[PDB]
Design an enzyme around this catalytic site. Structure first.
Site, PDB file in Angstrom:
ATOM      1  N   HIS A   1       0.825  -1.190   0.000  1.00  0.00           N
ATOM      2  CA  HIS A   1       0.000   0.000   0.000  1.00  0.00           C
ATOM      3  C   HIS A   1       0.864   1.245   0.000  1.00  0.00           C
ATOM      4  O   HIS A   1       0.793   2.072   0.918  1.00  0.00           O
ATOM      5  CB  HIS A   1      -0.917   0.013   1.213  1.00  0.00           C
ATOM      6  CG  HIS A   1      -2.082   0.940   1.072  1.00  0.00           C
ATOM      7  ND1 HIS A   1      -3.277   0.731   1.720  1.00  0.00           N
ATOM      8  CD2 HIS A   1      -2.243   2.065   0.333  1.00  0.00           C
ATOM      9  CE1 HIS A   1      -4.129   1.687   1.389  1.00  0.00           C
ATOM     10  NE2 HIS A   1      -3.526   2.505   0.546  1.00  0.00           N
TER      11      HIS A   1
ATOM     12  N   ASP B   1     -12.056   8.442  -4.940  1.00  0.00           N
ATOM     13  CA  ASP B   1     -11.750   9.780  -5.455  1.00  0.00           C
ATOM     14  C   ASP B   1     -11.810   9.844  -6.972  1.00  0.00           C
ATOM     15  O   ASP B   1     -11.950  10.914  -7.537  1.00  0.00           O
ATOM     16  CB  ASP B   1     -10.384  10.261  -4.981  1.00  0.00           C
ATOM     17  CG  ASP B   1     -10.387  10.680  -3.528  1.00  0.00           C
ATOM     18  OD1 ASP B   1     -11.284  10.234  -2.775  1.00  0.00           O
ATOM     19  OD2 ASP B   1      -9.499  11.471  -3.135  1.00  0.00           O
TER      20      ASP B   1
ATOM     21  N   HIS C   1      -8.443  15.715   4.103  1.00  0.00           N
ATOM     22  CA  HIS C   1      -9.581  15.925   3.199  1.00  0.00           C
ATOM     23  C   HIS C   1     -10.039  17.377   3.054  1.00  0.00           C
ATOM     24  O   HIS C   1     -11.042  17.647   2.400  1.00  0.00           O
ATOM     25  CB  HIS C   1     -10.767  15.068   3.632  1.00  0.00           C
ATOM     26  CG  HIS C   1     -10.532  13.599   3.479  1.00  0.00           C
ATOM     27  ND1 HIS C   1     -10.753  12.935   2.302  1.00  0.00           N
ATOM     28  CD2 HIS C   1     -10.094  12.673   4.365  1.00  0.00           C
ATOM     29  CE1 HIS C   1     -10.466  11.652   2.464  1.00  0.00           C
ATOM     30  NE2 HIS C   1     -10.066  11.470   3.704  1.00  0.00           N
TER      31      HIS C   1
HETATM   32 NI    NI Z   1      -7.543   4.407   0.572  1.00  0.00          NI
HETATM   33 NI    NI Z   2      -3.790   4.902   0.272  1.00  0.00          NI
END
Ligand code: NI
Ligand code: NI
Ligand code: NI
Ligand code: NI
Ligand code: NI
Ligand code: NI
Lengths: 101, 566, 100, 566, 566, 100
Positions: D133, D220, D319
């Protein structure tokens, strides 16, 4: 004790020995200062310096290498010249010779 | 006209007869000769000599040098002279008088449009140092060494691995190939040593064919007579050098047995004094033989007040010895001897020891090979006075004898003197420029293959390069492809022929070693003495022709606290 | 100054020690890196003063006590080593079991 | 002869029955087996065993290993055993007994002249970690991860660009090609993820053909059912993995709709607990399905006293949420839930969650994947005691279950387990050596492809490598061409066939991913639990079979203030 | 619906009519136009516009851009407008409205699966700066310049060598070849200048054929009429530019003689004011001629209270002048004149001087070209008010005139405007993103060839990229092969044809210079004034049409102490 | 902070000066690098205060005297140069023969 100090022996060094020299009176007629280097072909210096350009042909200043002589506006002084050596071929400067002599 | 000597020295650097103090030591050098024509010196700058039609000629690039070091005071094994140095195609072109033949006399180094200038007036120029005792524990060592003035590094290792922490060995084809590839990233010339401890010849030949320029015999891998003979046999047939770290334990025999195994064949004995390893307590007697090229590692150079204390514990930590167990500290006492440590300094002064090296991060300081070599010379002058070979009121000969210890001699010992090692025509232009006040301590410019590779550099955003902070930073000579072109990777003749460079896709210039078997003690420049030396088995006292060899420990040394922040 | 790589590296040790020094002053029990940095910097200054290697190997064992560091820290440091420029050049100081 | 167990452990490391504490945690491991022959252990050093004719044989390079890790205590998913590890051609050759068959018995790992030695007695050796990740926000992340013990990094990004700050996507052929080229400069194995959010298959195929080994579906870019199905269809045909960050807003549907869109096809759900993104507030229920390979990101591991406070504001800053506008803080409350955060720790302990990852610089700490995984295990032992699978008075099984979370499982999930992920023969030699007092915190040596790539290194100019300051520095394995040879760039089968490596002129070794579609929850080593888990829509309480799953927040954790300067 | 202007500006950046202050100066810019459709702006993020089927379309990579800079406020010589910027294949694709044609209107920049996003709302975007007066004293200068916002560097040098310390010359084929190879390692576009001081044409042609894109005539190598004419003759035949540093000593003639030698041929005069070098004291009169492209170096920009004091001593140190010897300080007085230094600021404001450059580490600050250019504009607004060309209540025209000084004009002067220099379609995507509070001081992102090359980056191990310490760090665009693809090495047409790139094995993209002989003062964007300027030989006063040109020294400047730590 | 390379480089000079400062305080005679760092840092702070270049060129010559540094040090430092951000931008301060 001074790190890296020199211990120069007293005396003097004779420069450009065994070479032809000559003295010339030079006068700066311009309104701005002119400064000439030790190895510049004196006969092709700034046109504002009035002297016998013909006598200076193939000559340079007889001063320690790397140094120069300054002429403030209107300044007149006598300098000593030493003849070029090597092949005696002049290339560059004001482009007046561009060849031997 | 006429100019006084002092004004002359300030403008063009010193000339014949002038003396210069080396840093803060008691060593003074005197200019022996000046190759210039007074009044025709070349100087660069506004209104100076190196200008079109004047000190700079009209020749094409092929007829002039790429770089000229003006008014340099050269200090090399062959002389201490004032001259201009011309560099062309990355190599030393000429040592003479630079300029333009059109208007100047005696010009031997033509300056043209294609010539860059480095002003060396007032500076001392020397060849790059050569360290032949490198443990490749980490790549950071190359920058540290380069900054100190060392341009070639010979050794072995694979990184911070146990085998490498202890020995200068790059074991086998895979690691050798890997390290040759990694070398392209480092700004110094490099040559690798393989593991020479085996009694099967083919296992050594493989390593040589893979690329090593020498073999290290180390006691940790077994420095037995069988192994030693095997390594020397292969060395004799493949023209590579053998470096030795003998049996300290006297497990397979005493020093005489090892010498017997060597059988008059050429060999480079590492840290011949013994502290760094070797037959306890007389490995030092090896410097008496004609086939032995002896070197010292640097922590013992020179003998000082804190030496024994630090060494006893250094050895303890390095060998994982238990200090409270009497049986271990006895071996400690056998290796670290005040008697041999003090004698070693004198043996260097007499020329019985011919090389100095570091032994990087394995009982040696990588950035202190040059620095310590000069500290020894200083200490020896102070204690013993002028050498019998000195002439005149200067230390010129002592200086030539000592500079040879980390330049020409290591080059000869490892078969690379045809490429590097000294300032002579045709050799790679690995040069170091020094300011006299910082000689041997902090270089002004380090040139690799004709390009500046590292130098002190001030504030990057400043109006000039001199404002603080000034610290060493990599230059263009250390960048990518320019680096490859300005460095050498040394290979054995067998590897060169097998096309190893092409197979591994090595990017740097390649050089081949040769003449490793034919060098002998007599070939070591200014350091060819073969003394009738003995070591008392009980007292450890070193004697030459019966006379006791010793020296006193220094309490303070030059090239130390006056120059370093820590 | 013409600082070499090793001089610049030591500036890192000195600064790490400044962090430790201030924390000890606050009354905190030092952790592993803080302890190594503090004792190390002490030795480098000793060498600048001109103290011998023998003196420092001993003095270094009295900079911090077991009550000034976190649990387990003394055992994580069997020894501390550091080099500095003594009047007689670079020397290595090894302090065995510095914290007790 | 005879030797006491304590003296034995001090000399060769622990043996069968001895226990070792992992750093400063409450986790203890017990040696399950020792593959040596007492009295025949190999040890390197002065007068030790690994010497010519003794522990070192006469075989040629082809018949002996390049590197041997002696007396290592292996901790892997398959066992906690004492053995020697042989490495040849950059891969794990054997796990057994090293030495010379000429004089020693039971030798399975032959040591010869071509063998380098790493002394691992007293050390723990593990496979390199695998973080799946990664947000390629900056190249500096690779060194940070490498130092922590992570040798493979899978993710997506193009630098500090908005798309990358938020998602693990390397958009399109141009950026993918650019990033594959840049990867050659990094010292870790790398595989890239493309942008999977599109409802046109050919736009995904292009990216796969360009080189990505997986596709990231992120909310997103629109985590809609149409996009998800499209990505999975292409994944099914090109044998690549899909990573999911679901629709937190519940804009296109609830978690059940997303699961319906997935349609039983294989998928790796990122940060399955929800804080890092996903259907509010029940994305966690995904760990119940057989086709879902669930992982956590690290800021929520483990649940501590400051977690909620930092997270609420972290989410706000990340965010660009306005804290005073009630409408925004409501969404904040929906994402950060104490209920799911506490349950996640337990679900890891039970094996319902199978992987741990960072989520580098996008709500995750790149250098804390390993460290946090062990902190969770510690906290779970303290709170829940021994696992039902434990045998003996040790935490061996819990240790095997947790180490699998960042080694073998991520490798299986992304189709690279044939190359890396564990210490098994034939796999790339990506190994990490740890001192027990620093396990999981600060490595002693990090090996990449058979070469040390980074390790703690002391003063470069010191007599030994141990003097201060000691800090992590790149070694030879991280340099130019040696680096290329010791690292892998993973490609999709389509890219490999299209000759992408040749077209981009990629210098590193290439590996192809395979088996991404066939992995299922049942294949996750020691973490295959599929619990009947439910989340209360109103209270957010997590229950498994009706029982409430929860835990208490830690006020102090191990592997924290005792090790770090800041 | 409807939204207020303030809320609009906070969400999408300013629009038509809004004004923005440039950093802490008195300069205000007003948005002249907005290419969007209100309500259809693209915004990236959770639940935002750039998502599948919404603001992101279904087109293949070939039909969409690789990168989109959303809602950017462009500041370029042609306008100050709000728009989206599309980048494809490393070049500027379009300036317009981004989105998906499937559901949005007026879309000119299609966003697809292969599109990366950089959110520029609230930011100012400009072309990368171009410094044409670089002394390659050290490679570190490239990073310093890049961080400041300069993406192309033209100059000459070989490292910290005397010739380079004084002149921007890379002497001859060998050094030129070496420097072209080294350039591949630097993250900026590069073009080299050779030594033009020779009276033999072939010596110049060789250098041009080797790769230099221009020739530097410097007085230190002899700026004589013969040399100047020779350089210009070759320049005329090989389409390369000549940069001049005239004869300060007036040794070969006065300024009028030099101008006579130039003979109406195109030439770039360096530091035309004189402090940095040139005919004392009237070299400044050169800006009156049509064939002269005049630039300033930065230490004199702008005139401040400490300028003269620092300069007098800077010149002294730089030229090794002896302060106590009256003869040397007279030359010092002739070069540093308050009269010409004050006038230079005004001449820039009037457009008589067309370029700004550094003169890196040779009387110039490499990281202050942009910063100082804006400080001059600020000081000129404060002292002289609005320019005659201004329209509206803003400083838009003054801003366009000044930004052209370090972007488009240097590009035109050196024949590289076809590749870089401004934000126009088809040009290399070298862009700089700025936050208004830090405009001209510290960039938010520096993009090279379509990839971010350097940007501020916080804690690498943090949960987000913003935590402290935040400092500039190299990104993927500055790494190995990705770097080569995103940078350009400029060559002369002759070198390109000779296959120099292939011979030296240059890895970066290659660009050829052209149109260096045809540019004239009239072509300099917003800076084409040819004033009837005179300098009094005695008083040094500068007059234009008889009126005295002067200004007052600043005691405090913007873009200074409020931003820097030191 | 968005520290540029030059700001970070100056942090190195500042730290070197902290080392010198503490040693001088102990009563030691400073060596070459310590002297250059101490005087240099003094100037940078002067510029932060808003002092002129002219004032600093003079004040810089009174930071250390010949009796506070080792033998040979004054001669190893013919001058000291450093740049810093003055109220009117970056300026260069050159202090000739700083130690006497
Ligand atoms: Ni994520
Ligand atoms: Ni991520
Ligand atoms: Ni040895
Ligand atoms: Ni050694
Ligand atoms: Ni100039
Ligand atoms: Ni210049």
């Amino acid at each position: 004790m001074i790190p890296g100090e020199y211990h120069v022996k007293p005396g003097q060094i004779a420069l450009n020995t065994g070479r032809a020299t000559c003295r010339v009176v030079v006068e700066n007629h311009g309104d701005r200062p002119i400064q000439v280097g030790s190895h510049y072909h004196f006969a092709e210096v700034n046109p504002a310096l009035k002297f016998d350009r013909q006598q200076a042909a193939g000559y340079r200043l007889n001063i320690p290498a790397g140094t120069a002589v300054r002429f403030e506006p209107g300044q007149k002084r006598e300098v000593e010249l030493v003849a070029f050596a090597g092949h005696r071929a002049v290339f560059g400067f004001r482009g007046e010779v561009m060849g031997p002599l | 006209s006429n100019i006084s000597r002092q004004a002359y020295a300030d403008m063009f650097g010193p000339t014949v007869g002038d003396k210069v103090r080396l840093a803060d030591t008691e060593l003074w050098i005197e200019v022996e000769d000046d190759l210039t024509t007074y009044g025709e010196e070349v100087k660069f700058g506004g209104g100076k000599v190196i200008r079109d039609g004047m000190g700079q000629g009209q020749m094409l690039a092929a007829d002039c040098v790429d770089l000229v070091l003006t008014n340099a005071l050269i200090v090399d094994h062959w002389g201490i002279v004032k001259a201009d140095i011309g560099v062309k195609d990355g190599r030393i072109f000429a040592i003479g008088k630079a300029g333009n033949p059109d208007i100047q006399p005696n010009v031997t180094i033509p300056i043209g449009a294609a010539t860059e200038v480095i002003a060396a007036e007032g500076k001392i120029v020397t060849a790059g140092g050569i360290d032949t005792h490198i443990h490749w524990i980490c790549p950071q060592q190359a920058e540290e060494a380069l900054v100190s003035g060392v341009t070639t590094m010979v050794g072995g290792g694979t990184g911070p691995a146990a085998g490498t922490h202890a020995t200068t060995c790059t074991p086998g084809p895979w690691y050798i190939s890997r390290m040759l590839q990694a070398a392209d990233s480092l700004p110094v010339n490099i040559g690798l040593l393989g593991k020479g401890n085996v009694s099967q010849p083919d296992a050594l030949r493989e390593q040589v064919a893979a690329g090593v320029i020498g073999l290290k015999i180390h006691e940790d891998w077994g420095a037995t007579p069988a192994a030693i003979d095997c390594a020397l046999t292969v060395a004799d047939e493949m023209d590579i050098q053998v470096a030795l770290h003998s049996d300290t334990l006297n497990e397979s025999g005493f020093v005489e047995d090892t010498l017997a195994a060597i059988g008059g064949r050429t060999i480079h004995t590492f840290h011949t004094e013994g502290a760094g390893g070797g037959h306890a307590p007389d490995i030092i007697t090896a410097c008496a033989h004609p086939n032995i090229l002896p070197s010292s590692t640097n922590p013992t150079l020179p003998y000082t007040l804190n030496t024994i204390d630090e060494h006893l514990d250094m050895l303890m930590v390095y060998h994982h010895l238990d200090p409270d167990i009497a049986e271990d500290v006895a071996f400690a006492e056998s290796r670290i001897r005040r008697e041999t440590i003090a004698a070693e300094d004198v043996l260097h002064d007499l020329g019985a020891f011919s090389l100095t090296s570091s032994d990087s991060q394995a009982m040696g300081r990588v950035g202190e090979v040059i620095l310590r070599t000069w500290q020894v010379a200083h200490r020896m002058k102070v204690q013993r006075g002028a050498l019998a070979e000195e002439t005149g009121d200067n230390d010129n000969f002592r200086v030539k004898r000592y500079i040879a210890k980390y330049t020409i001699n290591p080059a000869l010992t490892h078969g690379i003197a045809h490429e590097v090692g000294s300032i002579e025509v045709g050799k790679l232009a690995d040069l170091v420029v020094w300011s006299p006040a910082f000689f041997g301590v902090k270089p002004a410019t380090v040139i690799k293959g004709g390009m500046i590779a590292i130098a002190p550099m001030g504030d990057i955003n400043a109006s000039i390069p001199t404002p603080q902070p000034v610290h060493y930073r990599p230059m263009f000579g250390a960048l990518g492809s320019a680096r490859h072109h300005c460095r050498l990777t040394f290979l054995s003749q067998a590897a060169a022929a097998n096309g190893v460079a092409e197979r591994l896709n090595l990017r740097s210039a390649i050089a081949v070693v040769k003449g490793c078997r034919t060098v002998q003690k007599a070939d070591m420049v200014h350091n060819s003495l073969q003394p009738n030396i003995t070591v008392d088995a009980q007292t450890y006292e070193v004697r030459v022709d019966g006379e006791l060899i010793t020296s006193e420990p220094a309490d303070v040394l030059p090239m130390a606290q006056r120059y370093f922040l820590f | 100054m013409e600082l070499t790589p090793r001089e610049k590296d030591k500036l890192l040790l000195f600064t790490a020690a400044l962090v430790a020094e201030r924390r000890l002053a606050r009354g905190l029990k030092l952790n592993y890196p803080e302890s190594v940095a503090l004792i190390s910097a002490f030795i480098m200054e000793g060498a600048r003063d001109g103290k011998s290697v023998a003196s420092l190997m001993e003095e270094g064992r009295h900079v911090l006590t077991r009550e000034q560091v976190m649990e387990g820290v003394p055992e994580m440091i069997p020894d501390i080593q550091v080099e500095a420029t003594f009047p007689d050049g670079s020397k290595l100081v090894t302090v065995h079991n510095p914290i007790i």
